[PDB]
Amino acid sequence: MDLDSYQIALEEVLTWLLSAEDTFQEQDDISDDVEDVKEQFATHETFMMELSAHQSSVGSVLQAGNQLMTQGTLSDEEEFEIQEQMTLLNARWEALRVESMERQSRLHDALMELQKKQLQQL
Ligand SMILES: [Mg+2]
């Protein structure tokens, strides 16, 4: 019942996370040209908006797993399954969050740098 609904919500999250990881992995290196950097930067900001919008769902699933585990109604096998799912979900969410943020910093700095290199050639 609450096991079932946790499992449906975990599948929704993980389906979306696997693809967001793949998309992240497939974004190209930061381009040396300011018009290409604009588009990479613009693409990644939209991605960061996507991450943010999914953050409560990740936390919501992690909270549901935690409640199922503390409440005591589940088998030992199911608990080992849930604990491993929560541990890995949390590590994947966090890896993607850190790497995406680093990517955002680099694109921000690249775009500001390339723009200002245009400006000082007035
Ligand atoms: Mg943002």
Numbering used by the authors: 309 to 430
Task: Quote from the publication.
Dystrophin is a large (427 kD) multidomain protein expressed in skeletal and cardiac muscle where it binds to the dystrophin-associated glycoprotein (DAG) complex of the plasma membrane and to F-actin connecting the cytoskeleton to the membrane. Utrophin (Utr), the 395 kD autosomal homologue of Dys is widely expressed in non muscle tissues (reviewed) but is restricted to the myotendinous and neuromuscular junctions of differentiated muscle and is located at the sarcolemma of developing fetal muscle. Dys and Utr potentially act as cellular biomechanical shock-absorbers limiting damage to the plasma membrane with the spectrin repeat domains acting as spring units by undergoing force-induced unfolding. Dys and Utr-SR1 adopt the canonical spectrin repeat fold comprising a triple helical bundle displaying an approximately cylindrical structure of overall dimensions ∼60 Å length and ∼9 Å radius (between backbone atoms).
Additionally we have determined the structure of a six amino acid longer version of the Utr-SR1 protein (amino acids 308–430, Utr-SR1-L) produced as a result of presumed proteolysis during crystallization experiments of an Utr N-terminal two spectrin repeat protein construct (Utr-SR1-SR2; 308–537). The Utr-SR1-L crystals are isomorphous with Utr-SR1 with insufficient space in the crystal lattice for the complete two domain SR1–SR2 structure. For the longer Utr-SR1-L structure we observe the start of the heptad repeat phasing for the next repeat domain SR2. It is likely that this rotation is a result of crystal packing rather than a reorientation of SR2 relative to SR1 although variation in domain orientation is observed for this protein family; a complete Dys/Utr-SR1-SR2 structure is required to conclusively define the inter-domain orientation.
